[PDB]
Amino acid sequence: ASVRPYDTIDLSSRAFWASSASQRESSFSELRAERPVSWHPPVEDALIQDPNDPGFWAVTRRADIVAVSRTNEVFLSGNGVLFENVPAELLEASQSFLAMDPPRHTKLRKLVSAAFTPRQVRRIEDSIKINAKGIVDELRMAGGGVDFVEHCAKELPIRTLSDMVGIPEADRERVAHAADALVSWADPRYLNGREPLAVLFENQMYLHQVAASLAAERRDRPGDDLFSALVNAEVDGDRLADADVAAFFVLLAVAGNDTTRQTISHGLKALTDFPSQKAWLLADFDTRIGTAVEELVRWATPVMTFRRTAAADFELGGQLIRAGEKVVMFYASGNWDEDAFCHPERLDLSRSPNPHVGFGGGGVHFCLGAHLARAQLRAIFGELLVQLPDIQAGDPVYVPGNFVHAIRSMPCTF
Numbered sequence: 283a284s285v286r287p288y289d290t291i292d293l294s295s296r297a298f299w300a301s302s303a304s305q306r307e308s309s310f311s312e313l314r315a316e317r318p319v320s321w322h323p324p325v326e327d328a329l330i331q332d333p334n335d336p337g338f339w340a341v342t343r344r345a346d347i348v349a350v351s352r353t354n355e356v357f358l359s360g361n362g363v364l365f366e367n368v369p370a371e372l373l374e375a376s377q378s379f380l381a382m383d384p385p386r387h388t389k390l391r392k393l394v395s396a397a398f399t400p401r402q403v404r405r406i407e408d409s410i411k412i413n414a415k416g417i418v419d420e421l422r423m424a425g426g427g428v429d430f431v432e433h434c435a436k437e438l439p440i441r442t443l444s445d446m447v448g449i450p451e452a453d454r455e456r457v458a459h460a461a462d463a464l465v466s467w468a469d470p471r472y473l474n475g476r477e478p479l480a481v482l483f484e485n486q487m488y489l490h491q492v493a494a495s496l497a498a499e500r501r502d503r504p505g506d507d508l509f510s511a512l513v514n515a516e517v518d519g520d521r522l523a524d525a526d527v528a529a530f531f532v533l534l535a536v537a538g539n540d541t542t543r544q545t546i547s548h549g550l551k552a553l554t555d556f557p558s559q560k561a562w563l564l565a566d567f568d569t570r571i572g573t574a575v576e577e578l579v580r581w582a583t584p585v586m587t588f589r590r591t592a593a594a595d596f597e598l599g600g601q602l603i604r605a606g607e608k609v610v611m612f613y614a615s616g617n618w619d620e621d622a623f624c625h626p627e628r629l630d631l632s633r634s635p636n637p638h639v640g641f642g643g644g645g646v647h648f649c650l651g652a653h654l655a656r657a658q659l660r661a662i663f664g665e666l667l668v669q670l671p672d673i674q675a676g677d678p679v680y681v682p683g684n685f686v687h688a689i690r691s692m693p694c695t696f
């Protein structure tokens with residue numbers, strides 16, 4: 283029946299998700315301490331209001347986030363993974379195997395998983411380094427005071443993504459813009475008065491146009507790339523339908539662009555806010571970039587929320603989650619868990635171990651592009667230190683929303 287008192291702490295209002303991350307942490311802190319698994323009403327003023335939705339369970343502790351992520355046989359992804367209620371047509375055209383359970387998730391992920399192994403990322407790491415060098419070079423020619431997001435943070439992800447999938451150059455900047463749009467539906471500075479559902483469809487429609495054109499191109503002459511193997515594979519005795527192919531292209535475009543782009547912006551600001559941490563990394567880069575990248579991901583946590591649906595009754599945090607109830611993981615709360623980290627509010631690029639859940643709590647849906655993301659962050663931050671040793675981030679403009687911890691724009695000086 284899902285009938286129980288709602289928690290006192292507000293995790294659903296628009297104003298809560300339009301406030302600073304520090305303000306939200308004071309709410310996450312009390313929950314982590316007193317009621318780590320709490321019941322809340324659905325996200326207010328959602329893209330679609332669902333009378334079938336009684337609420338959700340808030341999972342704030344890192345250990346519990348790992349428990350939900352790894353126990354996928356109980357906490358399913360096949361009934362949706364987004365925190366806010368989103369119209370089904372928009373979900374069906376974007377989620378792909380992210381919102382899928384085995385065995386179908388195992389089938390589809392296997393078709394593209396070969397291009398993300400550490401071996402294959404090492405094979406293409408030089409091209410990422412070459413793109414990072416030219417991007418920082420072009421940023422230097424732009425001069426100080428320019429927007430770091432548009433002139434750097436968004437450039438390396440789309441170049442790395444498009445090089446793997448084979449996106450035509452004329453479509454590269456529009457795909458990056460369309461991918462960023464699909465997580466900015468709560469940003470008035472992005473909508474600019476437009477109703478969000480129409481903006482989401484328009485950008486989804488364009489990405490499906492690029493997907494249909496690339497799928498038809500690769501079915502004629504297949505290549506060694508990621509999209510070639512997907513559109514030419516035989517799944518259950520037949521090639522994948524156009525809807526499945528386009529949905530994965532959206533998933534790949536959004537996850538491959540938005541997450542790394544925000545981590546780069548958050549990383550430059552973190553290096554500016556902690557100069558002694560930047561000097562520590564610079565003093566021995568090749569030996570220390572590994573743990574530094576892991577903490578920059580922990581510091582950014584670009585994916586703030588992902589949800590699951592309980593397949594059966596499950597006891598978590600002293601609370602009996604019922605079958606069919608929504609369970610939301612708050613990765614920013616888990617990465618500030620005092621039960622897991624020593625002073626998580628301070629940037630420590632030497633943090634070891636770093637059991638952060640920036641790539642999720644681990645398990646079946648663990649981030650497909652984790653090795654690729656790490657290679658991008660190592661390359662772009664090494665080039666920013668090679669070419670622009672005095673670079674500093676300005677005032678960031680944070681994007682309101684309950685899904686991605688995003689910076690709309692941020693000037694930089696050097």
Ligand code: HEM
Nearest residue numbers: 379380537538541542585640641642647648649650651655
């Ligand atoms: C750089 C290129 C990236 C690509 C191509 C990529 C792609 C993907 C894909 C395809 C999935 C779905 C995997 C599945 O459902 O089995 C996924 C999951 C995920 N990704 Fe990534 N991603 C990238 C970077 C990142 C970064 C930098 C972060 C965070 C710092 C991130 C956070 C996540 C999270 C939280 C999940 C869900 C994990 C879970 O549900 O357990 N991604 N990614």
Ligand SMILES: CC(=O)/C=C/C=C(\C)CCC=C(C)C
Nearest residue numbers: 376377464482532533536537
């Ligand atoms: C409105 C809309 O289309 C939402 C699309 C959301 C995704 C394609 C999920 C992206 C996956 C990540 C960021 C790990």
